């Protein structure tokens, strides 16, 4: 759906509780798996010995004369011994049947646990990426003092937890693959997983539960000797400047989410391993909730109020812009507010401004999330062969106002920008249209002048100018240094209020990561990853879908001869509207926009050769109300 | 020290804690049946008036059955020793130990609250200076 | 269990770090005392 | 991978390494003497013409002596299995493993010398800047 | 032996620290590479 | 062994006293950066 909605720490904990309830639903009986195996081996040894004795008695009773009374007595003794042997064999067969019905239930439970754990972990992929970016951008050469204060006590527990989780996932995947591709072979397949379960569930000193508890202890800082790992990690992240997406609040929240979800996955692994061995079911819901609540309370009361909700652009790109008039209007419809921006410079610089409705306590509604794309954003911020004067001001609005429209106007190299903010009333989430304020630089006199000096192009901001999650902004500004010719888009988010009212008090949370995919594009299945492609159709078998002949591992459309791929997109093509056509191609392709009846090429490439993949972006216009126009590759 | 003396008061004479197989229910009847069969076979052998080779092979199978019965009886005796003369004593010792430990820990309850209050005061108002007043060498042992 | 990570080993290590039997005598008791005696802490009772 | 396949080639069918008690010398003669005595007693019992109670008590003591002999024979059989069908195979596997490991490590001998030379160059001329280019999180695992 | 201090655990930890699967991605390979590539080292062979 | 070990250890009593005096006189309030670089890898082996 192009939107990666994050349900919060509370949502992750609720999912873990659901998986716990699913695990507890599988009844394994009243005997531990180890006890069952011990009983099985004991009965097997006894049955083997009794079978040997009975065979010897039978072979010595059917050979000699054995008289009459002696034969009867030996027959009675053999009957009694065979009755004992049959009782032992019945017990052994009962054990075998119990094992043969216990193993499939365990395998099904493990498969369900793996599926639901993967579904939950899909949420934190974006947060892991953000933490990795922060780590890469971290200035560790001079911050080794702090980075050796946070990761000096949490490191052992973190390593143990990560190793246990990864090994459990790997073993569960291996068992699932083996089952997809009876009791004895199942035990031979699950022996390694059972050994891991014994290792992690061993109620001993320095156990997995020990490291799980010490992880929380180090994060909170219960002991007087140590220091809270969360607080020192927040100090490490927030100090200096980390030029990444989101503000300090978002970065520290992402770090907290990573640690919390690691703990939740560790508790899930512990519960699954306890159920796998058939041990007693102890619900870790209370202790997991206590740990997560303590960590969230520490973050809320000792970290969050001191953080800054100010986020700037991730990086800069040195470009030479243009001159003459250039007007952009990031207007949002009534009831909407701007939640983030993105400047992308791959082929043609573009500006994506995200607008959405609000759902109380500064919550961005994913249902109404939309974007506005402006082309040639480099021509607005940078000059070509003259001097550009910027009239910059921190367009800060009072708390409770949400910015709706941001306007940039570059006229005679005079970049003047204004913003409008409407009243929000967070108690009901209704953006009032009558009550608004305007912060404008259209009437300023002081400016900052930058000369292009040919090759010395200006550093246009580049990246996602947004919080770690989309949120309304109450302050927007453009900063110009005039020394290194660097332009910075700096905004202030409302993430703190939504975190305080939704996730840090254990309520429903709906956080939207800034999309890395154009969500307003009309090409259904823009990147071919979804199976059974309905929009994409092939005229024949000449052209197909290569599962590895694309970007990274993208299933790119491969065309060989007369074959072509068609996709009807005439319904969503608005008349008299400008469009951007962008595609990454390899070889000598050709892209057309046919109109079904009376086939004409509104747009056509018909050339372009490249031994490697390159991105081509062009402009297009539809004029005479097509209502029927299909893309052909 | 008093609790140590109480712990040392428990006899546990030449006994070591083992694993209760939880198989007493089946092992008891198995041992009874095997004992009956072995007794009947022993009576048959002792009655005499049998062929020498037949008597010898009956003696051999009786010896093997007695080996099986002896193994079963040894396992059952270990289970009974664990469940009758060892576990009750250990449970009584644990009850007394936890009672006296709770009685002693009742003394350190106000001081634990004072330490918790001091910790709650420290983390609310502090800075990197607290980093200079922290020990890491003691954290593993203390946590353990 | 008796090994290099035994519980008794951790007890002895805890005692040694408390009394200051480290490489450079960093006693945990003195460090914790100087941490507690900061005037920022406002709780009942004297430093003693 | 080839050495892994060679290791997996060793059968070790349903056998687990145990502790060789090193008591084979005494246990062999003890087992022989006990076997002789048990055989003589079994022959005496099987000859018949004995009192029923006397025959029954002789059978009981013969069963107990057979239990002792069976325990001794089981211990001796475990020792023989360790020393005859398990240890030679494990020693051959270890010989092959160490030969192939030495052959593979002969490849990494120039590179070890290069790393040693780099280390000898680093510690001679360096300062606290090297502190900024050191990792402590990997030292325990690497040393282990 | 399978436990929290197993040899396989140390192997996995060594691999993770090498590739940089830490809390803050401090890859040991990159740190060691930037340590080796210092011009103060005068030994045969290029940095590669 | 105990007698001869005590006889040998009698020699290093003065050196232990000197090291203790150095540790007491050490300005650890601002030298925690270095003191956490030396006693961070040697500490486990030293304790054992």
Author numbering:
A (entry chain A): 14 to 194, 202 to 653
B (entry chain B), D (entry chain D): 30 to 173
C (entry chain B), E (entry chain D): 222 to 269
F (entry chain C): 126 to 173
Give the article text.
Here we identified Vip3Cb1 and Vip3Cc1, the first Vip3 proteins with broad lepidopteran activity discovered outside of Bt from Paenibacillus strains in the P. popilliae-containing clade, most closely linked to P. dendritiformis. Vip3 proteins, including Vip3Cb1 and Vip3Cc1, are highly conserved in Domains (D) I and II involved in pore formation, with divergence in DIII, IV, and V known to be involved in receptor binding to the gut of the insect host. Vip3Cb1 protoxin and trypsin-processed Vip3Cb1 toxin structures were determined using Cryo-EM, resulting in density maps with an estimated resolution of 2.6 Å and 3.0 Å, respectively. Therefore, structural comparisons of Vip3Cb1 to other Vip3 proteins, including commercial Vip3Aa, are consistent with other results, such as amino acid homology, that all Vip3 proteins share the same mechanism of action, even though these originated from a Paenibacillus strain and not from Bt.
